[PDB]
RNA sequence: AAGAUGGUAAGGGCCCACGGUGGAUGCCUCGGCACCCGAGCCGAUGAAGGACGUGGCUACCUGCGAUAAGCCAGGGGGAGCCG
RNA sequence: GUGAAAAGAACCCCGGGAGGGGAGUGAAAUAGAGCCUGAAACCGUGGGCUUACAAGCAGUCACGGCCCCGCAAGGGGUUGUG
RNA sequence: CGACCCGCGAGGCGGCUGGAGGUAAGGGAAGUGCGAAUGCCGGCAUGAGUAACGAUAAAGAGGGUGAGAAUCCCUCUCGCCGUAAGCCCAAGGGUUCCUACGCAAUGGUCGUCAGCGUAGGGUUAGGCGGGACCUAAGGUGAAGCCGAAAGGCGUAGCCGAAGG
């Protein structure tokens, strides 16, 4: 009951998968996959993960049906950024910011 | 456009070093001055074999 | 606890770690106080490789740690130890004075 | 030198945004299988429109 | 037929819960500070301070110098050790 | 700056490995390896009130409509018009 | 986190988290209370998912190894240098040149690739360049003169190289 799969430390951006996740609220799981093969978007490669770690945990572990299984409350939060320079034409030196994310699911029965 | 470094090291060595420090009355104050500054480890002895 | 320290070997009584009980001890440290009046069991991992058997586990790790383990036990166990009268040529004498005497003579026990 | 002033709110910031959603893609089953596909496009598991061309000969 | 006409939220606000990022406050310290006392020069029998080498396998500090994690005598110490 | 002690995670299950869910250690792993307590700015996911003919740094002072805590008396959040 | 006491700064009293220290009617001694100094160190936002990706010598296709490729390897067409974007020596750098593993971070994109990460291996001189041979500008310097002290000039001699 309430499987949960946590994918921490993976780098892109939070704010490269606010895009794709929100297209898997509310959907079941035989239609959140087929909607998360075909789309574009780098960084729907990495919430095609976590669900099939998160159906493995529902369906070994925690001993639930099969096929039953709705994508219920699947969220994105920060991480821990890290900084390098980039050199910006007459002296002047600058910071850019390389940040990471944790994409985490959580998983229901209805 | 040759900005002003232009390395060479025979002229690391007669202008600075052991054998330039150690003639001048002026020179010997700066070895007995970095032996107990906090013991600098080294500075001049950049150069090669 | 120090390069001055006590116990050679000997039958060496416990009090306060929900034990009470006591026989010998076995190889003692000296800079952490490490040794073995056998009663601790643990549960160390054995990683299972060929260097190994196939299947083994723990069990053998004890270290009582402290000063905790009172002294050699005669009929009266409370006991420290005073140093020599020495009532012969020179002895050194490094026997317990205190209550009654069955305290590492050179006899069967030691 | 077309620099800006004051800063923008939390609640503007966020009504820009409000507009960037996207939308999901269009899906159709392969008549010849039992699966999904993009409504145009040769079917990489079933084969064909009419006469196969692809697929693991 | 001329009705205060109203139940919707691409989005925005206020409040209440539950998590992440961050590193302040509390409790500690093998590290310092200021006054007192014991004491107060080493060196061509080659000094203060350094380079390079030395562990069965070794990167770095510490100890030692072709006898190189050491050798020979005297005392203490009384049991485990090969920084 | 983990714990009194490392007993610092054998072995199965998704994964190219990271990383995670179960077992197991422990008085407690929201005490797990940048690991004592762990605040504010900052960024999020669910529930309550409210709005797409209306003009203002903000709020305050009234009256009404929902939500909640109340045995009842009474109180807090929310804001439509003056 | 919160609807008992003082006019106020503030004290109590209850409810969760924490994990071993705190003191108290009456007195004493000062590093004794912060929004502002274009104040100082540390976090995090705004502009914004926009300007940019560093030369107008272009690329395309087929098979491979892999979990995974417009970007890594070979085969076949297409274009630019060709007095230089091609080979050979001195400076300067001083590790990684070559092989077998690998992808966390650096390559302003990817990457199974590398000048990147751990492990092992590799530069052989009587006859090539320089010392055990000379001297130039300059330097150092017995004797000799010197300058309140430090030190300054100087004869023979000696060091001094892409020159003999």
Redo the contacts with the bound molecule.
């Keep these: 009951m309430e499987?949960?799969?946590?994918?921490?430390?993976?780098?892109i951006?939070?704010?490269?998968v606010?895009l794709v996740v929100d297209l898997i609220?509310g959907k079941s799981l035989e239609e959140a996959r087929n909607i998360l093969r075909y789309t574009n978007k780098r960084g729907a490669y990495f919430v095609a993960?976590v669900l099939?770690?998160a159906a493995?945990?529902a369906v070994?572990?925690?001993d639930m049906l099969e096929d039953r299984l709705y994508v219920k409350?699947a969220?994105?939060?920060?991480?821990?950024?890290?900084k390098?320079v980039?050199?910006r034409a007459r002296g002047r030196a600058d910071i850019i910011?390389?940040?990471t994310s944790?994409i985490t699911v959580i998983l229901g029965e209805k | 456009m040759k900005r002003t470094w232009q390395?060479?090291?025979?002229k690391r060595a007669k202008t600075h070093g052991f054998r330039a420090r150690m003639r001048?009355?002026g020179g010997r104050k700066v070895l007995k001055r970095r032996?107990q500054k906090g013991?600098w480890?080294?500075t001049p002895a950049?150069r090669?074999? | 606890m120090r390069?001055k320290?006590?116990?050679?070997?000997g039958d060496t009584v416990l009090v306060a770690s929900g034990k009470y009980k006591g026989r010998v001890g076995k190889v003692?440290?000296?800079?952490?106080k490490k040794y073995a009046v056998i009663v601790e069991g643990?549960?160390?991992?054995?990683?299972?490789?060929r260097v190994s058997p196939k299947?083994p586990?723990?069990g053998f790790?004890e270290?009582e740690?402290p000063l905790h383990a009172s002294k050699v036990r005669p009929i009266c166990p409370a006991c420290g130890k005073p140093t020599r009268v020495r009532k012969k040529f020179l002895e050194?004498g490094?026997k317990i004075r205190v209550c009654a005497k069955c305290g590492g003579a050179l006899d069967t026990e030691e | 030198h077309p620099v800006?002033k004051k800063?923008?709110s939390?609640?503007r910031?966020?009504?820009?945004?409000?507009?960037?959603?996207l939308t999901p893609p269009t899906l159709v089953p392969c008549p010849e299988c039992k699966a999904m596909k993009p409504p145009h496009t040769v079917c990489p598991e079933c084969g064909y429109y009419a006469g196969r061309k692809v697929l693991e000969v």
């Design positions: 499987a949960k799969a946590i994918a921490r430390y993976v780098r951006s939070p704010r490269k606010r609220r993960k099939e770690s493995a945990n070994n572990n925690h409350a969220y994105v939060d920060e991480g821990p950024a890290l390098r980039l050199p910011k390389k940040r944790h | 390395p060479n090291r025979r001048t009355p032996r013991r480890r080294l950049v090669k074999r | 390069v320290m006590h116990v050679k070997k003692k440290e000296v800079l952490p643990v549960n160390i991992v054995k990683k299972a490789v299947y586990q723990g790790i270290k740690a050194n490094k | 800006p800063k923008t939390k609640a910031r966020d009504a820009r945004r409000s507009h960037h959603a």
